[PDB]
Design a protein that fits this description.
This is part of a larger assembly, with chains A (50 residues), B (69 residues), C (149 residues), D (60 residues), E (91 residues) and F (114 residues). With 50 residues, chain A is an all-alpha fold. Chain A has 1 helix and no strands. Chain A has one helix spanning 6-17. The longest helix of chain A is centred in the first third of the chain and has 12 residues, at 6-17. Chain C is mainly beta. Chain C contains 1 helix and 8 strands; from the N terminus they run ββββββββα. By secondary structure, chain F is α+β, with helices and mostly antiparallel strands. Chain F is 25% helix and 9% strand. Chain F has one helix at residues 83-110; strands at residues 19-23, 29-33. The chains are: A mainly alpha (50), B alpha+beta (69), C mainly beta (149), D alpha+beta (60), E alpha+beta (91), F alpha+beta (114). Chains in contact: A-D, C-E. The complex binds magnesium ion (MG) (43 copies) and zinc ion (2 copies). Residues 147, 149 of chain C line the site of one magnesium ion. Chain F binds 2 RNA strands through β1 and β2. Chain C: There is a cross-link at residue 98 (Glycyl lysine isopeptide (Lys-Gly) (interchain with G-Cter in SUMO2)). Chain C: One of its GO terms (cellular component) is postsynaptic density. Chain C: This is Large ribosomal subunit protein uL2.
RNA sequence: AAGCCAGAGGAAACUCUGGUGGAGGUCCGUAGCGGUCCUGACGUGCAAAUCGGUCGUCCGACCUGGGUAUAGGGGCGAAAG
RNA sequence: AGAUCUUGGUGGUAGUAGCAAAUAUUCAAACGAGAACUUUGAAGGCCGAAGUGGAGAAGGGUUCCAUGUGAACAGCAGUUGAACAUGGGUCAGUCGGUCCUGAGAGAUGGGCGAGCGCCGUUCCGAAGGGACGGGCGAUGGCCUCCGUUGCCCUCGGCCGAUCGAAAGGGAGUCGGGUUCAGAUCCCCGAAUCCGGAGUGGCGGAGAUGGGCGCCGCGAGGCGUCCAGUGCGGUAACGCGACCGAUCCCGGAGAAGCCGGCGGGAGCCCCGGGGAGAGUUCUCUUUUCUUUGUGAAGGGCAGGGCGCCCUGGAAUGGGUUCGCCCCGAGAGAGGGGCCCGUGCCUUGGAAAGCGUCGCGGUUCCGGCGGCGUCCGGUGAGCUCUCGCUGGCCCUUGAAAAUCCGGGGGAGAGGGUGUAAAUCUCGCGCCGGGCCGUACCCAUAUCCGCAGCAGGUCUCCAAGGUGAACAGCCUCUGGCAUGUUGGAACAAUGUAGGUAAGGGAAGUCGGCAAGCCGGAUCCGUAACUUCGGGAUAAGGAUUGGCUCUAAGGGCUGGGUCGGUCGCGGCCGGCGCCUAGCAGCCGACUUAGAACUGGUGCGGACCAGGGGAAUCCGACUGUUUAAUUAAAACAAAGCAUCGCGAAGGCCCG
């Protein structure tokens, strides 16, 4: 909602910040074995814990 | 805002320490003198024009005499 | 709300400090606002006065009788009801009263009571006539009314 | 416009700007961004220019 | 003109609740909504406020009375008996 | 015609969400959120039902910034009791003290015979 | 519906007539709440109970948000397990 | 090789079912490789203010905004996207939270418990840690004297921590401008609340007079003495302040639902004056749009008063739609107060808006001209204020917080350009923390989804009409609901019509059909006398031209006997069966004429009657097969119980 507590806003802020693609240079590292961010979240596909 | 009735009150209001500026507005029917104090905007309404000119030259120095026209 | 008897708001003077004490007596029928009510042993027989049963005659009837000598009113509190002082014995300091149920009880002569019948008259004479009126009656008391067999 | 610590209030922001920029400020408006950072709109005193202050800070 | 032959005030209940119950509640409602002559100021403005509470609009006197009538016959006989026992008790 | 919206986040027609229509200098109608209607004091007698005169009817916390004269009447019990019941109390006090004097004299003269 | 006004008839008791008044778990009927029938539609559906028309009630035992209390042999039930 | 075996993969079905709920799209152009679907323009429609419009709460959490991409997703497509990528965006003393308490939750004391713990919330507590008041002192220090501090005396029951509402209580912010996305928050301008000022910031009030001796022509000066915690009104009460503690009293906060009136505003309507548009085949001095003044002060209307004074009323009178009111003081006259959201004024025109131009700062709060006017309506609609009633075996919160009064403990100065004190005017300083973007739903929430479901509110135009009905339209919005094209087989779903007959169909009039609005008549049995009842039954209804009836405002003088072609008194006269003029809503009734007898022409919109059974009625019930005769109900009857008690939890 528009009304929210500080802890809720901070939680949503962190969930925004960690929902991004991987950097392109990660795939250049030695022994990567990482292809994409498999923890990507969409606001309409799945809903947050709170 | 406050409306000043007679000339004397406007005179000693314009000489207050907190008076920042005085504005002279020339309307078709009157001339409004607007001193900007700390709390209020004191307006004196002068119907004629010769008294308005006398007041224009009788304003205290060191105060902004900004003309609105 | 929830009772049929009106309540009386009576203001007394605090005898030990400068203050006004407000009580919530049960209104004996006939009392009105601006009336003086006198409480104590030397009070006279008038509607609304409170005095011990040991000081009352043998046929007087009372409004808010004490079950024990010292608590507040406990008997004949519901609207229209009253108890009757029947007999005394100055020895053993006992007094016999007739309760609204018709039972006879022996109580101390120091029990206080209001003279008169409690206001609220014959409230049970009027038929309720409606499930809704019963609903509003019991909504202000407790959750008991719609009773399934 | 500054990005400030989330724990700092308006008085602390005002005093910090005044000390480490040697300027005088009129008022401070504060919001916490959707990313969790706190953002302060610090308005300078009328005798101070925000433009040349921004120049000597180096954010032109 | 006369609008009802016999129901009078309980014509608001329509055909419901039974004739005898309506007749039984008719006099109770008449006494409930009637205005009694105040015994303090003499004006006929003493009307019921809630059950057992009767208030006069003129002198603003509130009197504890019966549920539907200003005073019940029980209370009147009680007042007379208490007066007699008071005058017997003292001499 | 122009239709109006609430200017605050309270969207329900509660007692604290009462408005009135105002025409701004920009020639548009807006809500202005009104204040509750205040009440003049009731008399301390508790008998007569009217509210006192000469006292400005405002919300209770507005009385803090009002001058003294606006909240009372230049009379004993002014701004707390009505004039009529004050006259009644004066007469009642005087007459009851007179009655006390009368009964004191009456008992002082009745004890003359042993 | 009570209450009230006027006119008329009566010895009275009172009655008749025309207005006024606006009561009621009152009626018709929206929104709302519900869910009778078509045993209609659908029945790998729009829907793990919906849709169309037709319907019941619509000043009250009315409808409803939020906050609270009652927890499993317990709760709560105008009562159908 | 099996176990309707476990996990994974793959077929036929099968290019099949299907992409059919809510009327609808078409033309041109642009970008583009590519257009039924994007964008612009034109046209035709729809939502039709109880919206497909404009904004919120809960919930979502970045979906908001701009740019770029065309992998996947958006069940066709896409140049588009709530998709992907990259950046950006939420600014507060006065909008909320925060504070208060509600239903309730919950520690401590105590009790219980093997124990984690749980019972209890005033009950089995030494439960007040505060105080302007006085003294004793430390002089800490601008040691004048006021501020510190410790102890003692006196006073001190919130008698109970604490939590509990973004819809309850709760001081005080409005107008204009501005962005790609933010504003009651930014900028501009006007205010306002709370708190603080110790060295006291300035004024004003307190508060500055009388008596006597003298001087002095008087006026006025000197000495001395005595006052002075304001003043007015018969009153209601008023004036700018107006000393005062512990304590006490009271008020506000602070109160249901419904009815009927009246005041004010906003919208709607009508008549003009402008400005800009539309039509002009003919007519139309025409049709459409638009035509401001916030908060806070001051003044004045208007509304209300169960406020005051005079006076004393029956031949009772006043008065409302209704009521109601009066020797406990009517009518009448004169006042007082409250509200004042209305009008005028400061704000204020400098702004805003509409138009006509002129310069450019690639993108100007640019500059200029003119205007922003006069009226009338009303059972109109919506808010709001007020008055007065009705209903209740229903009486419709509490607390923070603020204020008034009673009382007079004390404080203040010796007549001074005076003191204590001040709720008066002005001035000075501060208001910290958190939320603030967007959606709020036939696509941003829940239902596995862009799901015909579900989800709490605010605003609400014109016509018809009883109407927030239905139907059409304006502002605003959209593209037909997850695809199109071509044909018009059967079968279906939804909607109609059908000669003659009229339930013969069927378990059964199921379904459909008939009736239907309004006016005028006219209404039975039966009845608990209220009803039945829109019983039943019949007639009328359009258009046009009239005619009657139903109202509101003003003014009615007999005149120079004279001078403020005008005014004071007066010889100077009979509307007294009331006239003259002006203005104004709708509504009803009647008449003529008239159309191919059609007229509640669409929409809206009861089929009726005679019975039997059951349940009195209204209500409720198996969410998802049973709405009933079932449950409830009022009414009736019985039982237990006087508190060491009845019933029940534990
Ligand atoms: Mg979802
Ligand atoms: Mg039962
Ligand atoms: Mg903030
Ligand atoms: Mg609130
Ligand atoms: Mg205004
Ligand atoms: Mg009904
Ligand atoms: Mg009905
Ligand atoms: Mg079916
Ligand atoms: Mg069974
Ligand atoms: Mg195998
Ligand atoms: Mg196919
Ligand atoms: Mg298909
Ligand atoms: Mg159309
Ligand atoms: Mg339409
Ligand atoms: Mg909407
Ligand atoms: Mg977008
Ligand atoms: Mg696709
Ligand atoms: Mg994304
Ligand atoms: Mg205590
Ligand atoms: Mg709290
Ligand atoms: Mg916005
Ligand atoms: Mg104005
Ligand atoms: Mg009078
Ligand atoms: Mg202008
Ligand atoms: Mg917003
Ligand atoms: Mg859809
Ligand atoms: Mg949906
Ligand atoms: Mg789920
Ligand atoms: Mg279609
Ligand atoms: Mg389409
Ligand atoms: Mg046929
Ligand atoms: Mg036929
Ligand atoms: Mg047959
Ligand atoms: Mg057959
Ligand atoms: Mg049928
Ligand atoms: Mg019949
Ligand atoms: Mg005709
Ligand atoms: Mg039934
Ligand atoms: Mg029966
Ligand atoms: Mg149900
Ligand atoms: Mg079922
Ligand atoms: Mg069913
Ligand atoms: Mg029976
Ligand atoms: Zn009386
Ligand atoms: Zn009084």
């Amino acid at each position: 909602s528009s009304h929210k507590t500080f802890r809720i806003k901070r939680f949503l802020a962190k969930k925004q910040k960690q929902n991004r693609p991987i950097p392109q240079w990660i795939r250049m590292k030695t022994g990567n074995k990482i292809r994409y961010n498999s923890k990507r979240r969409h606001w309409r596909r799945t809903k947050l814990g709170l | 805002p406050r409306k000043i009735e007679e000339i004397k009150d406007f005179l000693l209001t314009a000489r207050r320490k907190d008076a920042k500026s005085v504005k002279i507005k020339k309307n078709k029917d009157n001339v409004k003198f607007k001193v900007r104090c700390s709390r209020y905007l004191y307006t004196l309404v002068i119907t004629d024009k010769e008294k308005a000119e006398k007041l224009k030259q009788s304003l205290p120095p060191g105060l902004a005499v900004k003309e609105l026209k | 709300p929830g009772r049929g008897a009106p309540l009386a708001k009576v203001v007394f003077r605090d005898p030990y400090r400068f203050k006004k004490r407000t009580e919530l007596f049960i209104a004996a029928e006939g009392i009105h606002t601006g009336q003086f009510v006198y409480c104590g042993k030397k009070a006279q027989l008038n509607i609304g006065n409170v005095l011990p049963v040991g000081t009352m005659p043998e046929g007087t009837i009372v409004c808010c009788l004490e079950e024990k000598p010292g608590d507040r009113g406990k008997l004949a509190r519901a609207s229209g009801n009253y108890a009757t002082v029947i007999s005394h014995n100055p020895e053993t300091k006992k007094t016999r009263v007739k309760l609204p149920s018709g039972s006879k009880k022996v109580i101390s002569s120091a029990n206080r009571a209001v003279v008169g019948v409690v206001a609220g008259g014959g409230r049970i004479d009027k038929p309720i006539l409606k499930a809704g009126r019963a609903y509003h009656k019991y909504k202000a008391k407790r959750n008991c009314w719609p009773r399934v067999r | 416009v500054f990005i400030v610590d989330v724990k700092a209030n308006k008085h602390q922001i005002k005093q910090a700007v005044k000390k480490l920029y040697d300027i005088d400020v009129a008022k401070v408006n504060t919001l916490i961004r959707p990313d969790g950072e706190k953002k302060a709109y610090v308005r300078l005193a009328p005798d101070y220019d925000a433009l040349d202050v921004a120049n000597k800070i180096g954010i032109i | 003109a006369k609008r009802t032959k016999k129901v009078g005030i309980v014509g608001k209940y329509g055909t419901r609740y039974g004739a005898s119950l309506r007749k039984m509640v008719k006099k109770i409602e008449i006494s409930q909504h009637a205005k009694y002559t105040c015994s303090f100021c003499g004006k006929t403005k003493m009307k019921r406020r809630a059950v057992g509470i009767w208030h006069c609009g003129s002198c603003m006197k509130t009197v504890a009375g019966g549920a539907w009538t200003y005073n019940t016959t029980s209370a009147v006989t009680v007042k007379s008996a208490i007066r007699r026992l008071k005058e017997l008790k003292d001499q | 015609v122009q239709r109006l919206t609430y200017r605050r986040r309270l969207s329900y027609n509660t007692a604290s969400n009462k408005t009135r229509l105002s025409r701004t200098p920009g020639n548009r109608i807006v809500y202005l959120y009104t204040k509750k209607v205040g009440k003049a004091p009731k008399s301390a007698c508790g008998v007569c039902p009217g509210r006192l005169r000469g006292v400005r009817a405002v919300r209770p916390k507005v009385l803090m910034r009002l001058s003294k004269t606006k909240k009372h009447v230049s009379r004993a019990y002014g701004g707390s009791m009505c004039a009529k019941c004050v006259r009644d109390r004066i007469k009642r006090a005087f007459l009851i003290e007179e009655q006390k004097i009368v009964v004191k004299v009456l008992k002082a003269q009745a004890q003359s015979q042993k």
